[PDB]
């Protein structure tokens, strides 16, 4: 676990160093603001139907009563430009506040504690998350437990010994074709079938597919010894 | 999930087939060029909602030729190859119960862009996710696919809700009649009752009233003598027509911006439900969550996703 | 007829394609109107007939090209219209000129529409293909069969939020 994990950090460093587009989500924030600001600035150069876009030019040419007509066009148009900018910024404000709340949620579930949610902290069984600061945002490094290799085994729903069906207390029943073992679902760790690893429920005439075997009772040899 | 994609052209819409009228649009700057990017961004977001929800995996999982479910009948939710388009029996009713109109608006300058993800490929998403959950249980999305007997899959699902797995093996015979009968009631409710799909119908009608009203603005004079550009151009002088054209463009700009503003607001509401649809896929469908009444009333066990036009339908199994 | 023209009929000036219409307008009826109150059809004052008005200038223009450092090859895509002006192919999105059609399915690179995507590949040129949904994985299923992982790996996922 120390070799796989430590080797993973090296892959994150190489990935982040080589790939500059992984942060594009943050670059889009800077680009969006740059485009919105650049646009808002370039609208001042437009005449908005007026003879000229410069106010002093209108005042230095048209008479007082005539200049008001042209200035009204500039104001009316420039006011609408702010309405478009403010409106757009309020929309983007709803998009960033949604992501910010999501980040705060992940820090609570993924970072501070351990979350059992499915694919919320990333693929696999969530172990823990380490936050990292990024410009106008945050980065989350999610350590997870992903099973690698798998092998196919024979299973049975229950074991029949004394006439009463035996069920696993934890794990599942597995066999290679000879003896029946009880093991966890996340890994293969052979364990003998015992009264301590199973419990008695129902009978052997109910469970469909029940198999016969001998359930090892630790108390038998203790009484013999 | 997905909202109808509509791309409006402020160059053709504002001034129809008019060179002089269009000349006045340049004086307004990016107002036309700006509104084009606002609508384009909404069309791009429509494709990201279907990719982050419909398909949660990079592989396709198909059912085996010999299907043994342990006494349960999945034929209703399983895809039928006999049909020309592969879909589940439940998805067939959704397509019919959810409804030229576009020809009239398409010629006005409003173009409806087709979705990057066809409804045919969307149906195969639910077929892979629904097929992986049955054969692979809940472990197909968390890593390599685990082959597990479906009879033993529900045994643990009862353990997470506080019920010993011993009740499933013994009572699994009676669960076949309760589970199969529950699926049949859904098919009869959607076919007989058409009001259950009103949630998605309100989304289509929301855009319909916005498109038809936007086209009706051209008939309004907006303070101008007439609402037709050729009528004012052939009557009033170029300088006088510009005064009337100013009221036409100014009136149409306020109507065009009002439509774009509503689309951005409606798009935000759709994205809010998109995250929920993507959240229900992993927690309800893909995995199992101890949270109560998120997947529907009762202890959650398994969820079966179903494709629907401009949306998605979820079938949740509760205890 | 069957061509885009600029027509003046009974004082009504407009541009559109003139075609014979199957609609029968009453004698007192001169020009028809659609839901949008645009002219639906026209009637020639000389020889009385009903002509369907189909507007002109349909479809968009889009450019499909790889990065500049890749190559200067371009593929013109006309969306919402078939092939008119004019490697000339047609899709549900519209006429696509400048891109070859490869029946083999690959991973979507440059999205087009209707499940079709484009990429620059092998003497290399822009090719069009159906979006691949991923490799088919058939999980063997049997009542007595189970799969227990024999190995594990620790993975680190990088997620970013603004």
Numbering used by the authors:
A (entry chain A): 923 to 1147
B (entry chain D): 729 to 827, 848 to 1067
C (entry chain A): 535 to 620, 641 to 676, 689 to 728
From the paper:
Four cryo-EM maps of the Kappa S trimer engaged with ACE2, including Kappa S-ACE2-C1 (only RBD-1 up), S-ACE2-C2a (RBD-1 and RBD-2 up), S-ACE2-C2b (RBD-1 and RBD-3 up), and S-ACE2-C3 (all three RBDs up), were determined at 4.0-, 3.9-, 3.9-, and 3.9-Å resolution, respectively. Noteworthy, for the Kappa variant, ACE2 binding induces a more pronounced S-trimer population shift than that seen in the WT S-ACE2 system, suggesting that the Kappa S-ACE2 complex is prone to transforming to the more open C2a/C2b (51.7% population) and the fully open C3 (34.1%) states. In the meanwhile, RBD-2 swings away from the center and RBD-3 swings in towards RBD-2. In contrast, for Kappa and Beta S-ACE2 complexes, they all present pronounced population shift, i.e., with only 14.1% or 8.3% population in the one RBD-up C1 state while the remaining dominant population existing in the more RBM exposed C2a/C2b and C3 states with two or three RBDs up and possibly engaged with more ACE2s. Transformation to the fusion-prone C2a/C2b and C3 states can lead to loss of concealment for the S2 central helixes, which was offered by the RBDs resting above them, and decrease in S1/S2 interaction, facilitating the shedding of S1 and transformation to the postfusion state.
The spike (S) glycoprotein of SARS-CoV-2 mediates receptor recognition and viral entry into cells.
